Amino acid sequence: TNVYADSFVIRGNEVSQIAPGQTGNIADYNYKLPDDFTGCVIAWNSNKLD
Amino acid sequence: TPSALGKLQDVVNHNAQALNTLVKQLSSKFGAISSVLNDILSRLDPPEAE
Question: How far apart are CA A31 and CA A4, in angstroms?
Answer without folding.
Answer: 14
